[PDB]
């Protein structure tokens, strides 16, 4: 019911403002809290009554409300800050607590390693069983954000596509996978298939054919 933009960016030492838009029945009329979702943890309270810090939180954090909107300033950006930030208040039309959808703030203190991509064709075993899977393995990329396009010769494919969300690796770089399901006949009828991976606006595209090795 509250709108906050989805993502934010900076290098350690800089500063941002996450904005929270709502209405009359909530922000125009009620107080706003700010909660930090450290990845893979339950969220923690940062700010109530629009700007009231909680203990041990540094003054780097600042909140502010004006009529129908609110905003979380964060300065002197640090690693271990990067996480999901949600605004929250009470809406007096529906009689509930509401949150924003969240904003993911990544702190880029590591270099833009584009992804290493390995693409495998369908196995003998699988084709023998009347099935076909193409496997696209994406690794050692930074930051942890990518977008995937499969293409049968020159035509785009979105049907039978399963893509994982990026994950962190041993080295604090990221790894993802994408799977294309075909009939054996679709696999054998096309000259080639290609997984096209785009990272920070730049593409990597690996290609396989039914002709062996």
């Amino acid at each position: 019911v509250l709108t906050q933009p989805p993502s934010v960016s900076a290098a350690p030492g800089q500063k941002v403002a996450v904005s929270c838009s709502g209405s009359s029945s909530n922000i125009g009329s009620h107080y706003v809290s700010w909660y930090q979702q450290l990845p893979g943890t339950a969220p923690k309270l940062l700010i109530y009554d629009n700007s009231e810090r909680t203990s041990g939180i540094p003054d780097r954090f600042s909140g502010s409300k004006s009529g129908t909107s609110a905003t979380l300033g964060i300065t002197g950006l640090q690693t271990g800050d990067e996480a999901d930030y949600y605004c929250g208040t009470w809406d007096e039309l529906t009689s509930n607590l509401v949150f924003g959808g969240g904003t993911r703030l990544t702190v880029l203190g590591q270099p833009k390693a584009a992804p290493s991509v390995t693409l495998f064709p369908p196995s003998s075993e699988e084709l023998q069983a009347n099935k076909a899977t193409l496997v696209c393995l994406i690794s050692d990329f930074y930051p942890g954000a990518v977008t995937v396009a499969w293409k049968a010769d020159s035509s785009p494919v979105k049907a039978g596509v399963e893509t994982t969300t990026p994950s962190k690796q041993s080295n604090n770089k990221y790894a993802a996978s994408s799977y294309l399901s075909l009939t054996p006949e679709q696999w054998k009828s096309h000259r080639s298939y290609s997984c096209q991976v785009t990272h920070e606006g730049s593409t990597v595209e690996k290609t396989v054919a039914p002709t062996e090795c």
Binding site: H30, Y31, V32, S33, Y35, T41, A42, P43, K44, L45, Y48, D49, N50, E52, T54, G88, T89, W90, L97
Partner: peptide, 22 residues
């Protein structure tokens, strides 16, 4: 979903100050 308990308290408005692991 991951389900989380929380404590709910009041001041000028309402905030959740204590939370669980999920």
């Amino acid at each position: 979903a991951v389900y989380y308990c929380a404590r709910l308290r009041a001041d000028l408005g309402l905030y959740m100050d204590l939370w669980g692991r999920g």
